[PDB]
Design a binder for this molecule. Sequence first.
Ligand SMILES: [Ca+2]
Ligand SMILES: [Ca+2]
Length: 645
Amino acid sequence: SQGLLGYYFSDLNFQAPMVVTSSTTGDLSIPSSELSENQYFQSAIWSGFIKVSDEYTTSADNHVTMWVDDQEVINNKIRLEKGRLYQIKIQYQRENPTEKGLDFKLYWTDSQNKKEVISSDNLQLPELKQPTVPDRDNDGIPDSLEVEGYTVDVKNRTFLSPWLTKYKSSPEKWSTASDPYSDFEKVTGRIDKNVSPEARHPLVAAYPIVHVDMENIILSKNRTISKNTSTSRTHTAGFSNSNSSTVAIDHSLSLATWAETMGLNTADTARLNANIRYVNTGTAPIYNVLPTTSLVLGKNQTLATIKAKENQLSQILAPNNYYPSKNLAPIALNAQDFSSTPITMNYNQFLELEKTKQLRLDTDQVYGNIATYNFENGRVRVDTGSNWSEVLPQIQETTARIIFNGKDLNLVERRIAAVNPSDPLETTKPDMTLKEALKIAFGFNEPNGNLQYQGKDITEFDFNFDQQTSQNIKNQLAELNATNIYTVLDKIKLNAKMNILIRDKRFHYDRNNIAVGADESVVKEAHREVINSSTEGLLLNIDKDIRKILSGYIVEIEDTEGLKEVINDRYDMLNISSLRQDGKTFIDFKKYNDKLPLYISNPNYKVNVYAVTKENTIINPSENGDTSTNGIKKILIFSKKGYEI
Ligand SMILES: [Ca+2]
Ligand SMILES: [Ca+2]
């Protein structure tokens, strides 16, 4: 991944760089084919090192001053030894080249006086870590290019040129998002290949975000209860950077009371096992420390602490991915391990669990070491000297945060480099607009002068901010004499430490910003695409996001005077839908009608089907032990007479 590093300028004295690139060999040529009026380079500087056992003494020695260890070897047989790096610099100046590009080449000849063009094994890049071109942060991109904007073009080799994507970045910041990958590393691909594509932008932060997903649970007498669980990463807008997920435990029967199923009394004790995976929804991988997690009952009753053995991960935990991989078994809290700590609950705790059917997983931000690029060997490797713990707070202090749920209504967080007005040193950080932030961090695009996220217009999402950011953005709107944020997205300026929360408008949200319902019109409309209906059930085509907010359905026969009979008349029997492989929903009438189709004794009778949303879900008998669906808030989504079915 190596060779030297060249700057090619159109002016005579190195002030207006037009191409920045790296050659694998001593062939420092740029062919005009890889380039407009600006293709005549009047100067050029190359930097790097050379490696080797011998004495040794380019194509334009009358235009080239050169040094090997600030020791001019051109403008002379010098000695060099096996296993040592000699710093190299070459400068070049021709006024008025008649040709475009540069056919330039550097050679040495040995002691068997045999010449050669310097192999790709004797040339190394400068150490671009945190006769001179101005590069204050030593990332490799000249200050002028960072500020004015540049693009990168891939021929064969990356070519960096003044403004494909228009980049800008800070000439004062090795990594403009204060993360562990440099601006130059990101845009030339000298970076860990597991970093998310959008975090190869210098203004989008690369960092892990980890939470724990519980898939299922099993409670038992210390007679058992096994249930599936749904977990969501949460957010409560806030300014906290903690990781947390909430688990909802299936309250519906999976075989013909939790307290009645388990013979608990008072002095009894219950044990808990579960299956989990770690989930990385950030933009950078983790390699050798999984974070530690408290499993919490109620507000702050820690039932367990979940840990994985440091330095013995069986893999990467990559962005947009799971550990273990989904193709592998999940992690058991007490694995098939003598000395797994038992997870225990007293009677009171057990009833509290049954009351709420909820747990919380609080995960710390301890992510361990970083795989950084090494310029000495052009490889990416875990760097024991580099730790995420030192990086995360710098990222958090210099970026605006956008949390967005456009992807399956799951909360996804990105951080974007943005100016801090009070910081005297960030006169140099690129201005970041809200609109550009959504495009680069989340992939919004604008086909027809309308900002969209995968088919959904931006106005289908609501904008919410923390208190400081609200005041800031309100002030901006008035300054713009704008009334409406959607119309001035391109002019809203983002600052460091802003928090912005963007949520699909069709839904209702709990205080964790999980989608837990939708207004009745939304719900009814999502159920109008009926494919088939019969006395055995309904086949519908229902939007994925809609299904996510539904806990179940209630089926009901209504006679001609409107007397109603609820077929699945228990709060724990609403789980009669399933999602077929063609993506359609089947609502099964037989499942709790003793496996029989409905019996409609009169064709004029109605079959009504109601959806129940998450937030309206009853998860226990009432105070007096009522287990019926009486009282449950439900939404009519199908109603037809016997003779229409
Ligand atoms: Ca730079
Ligand atoms: Ca920079």
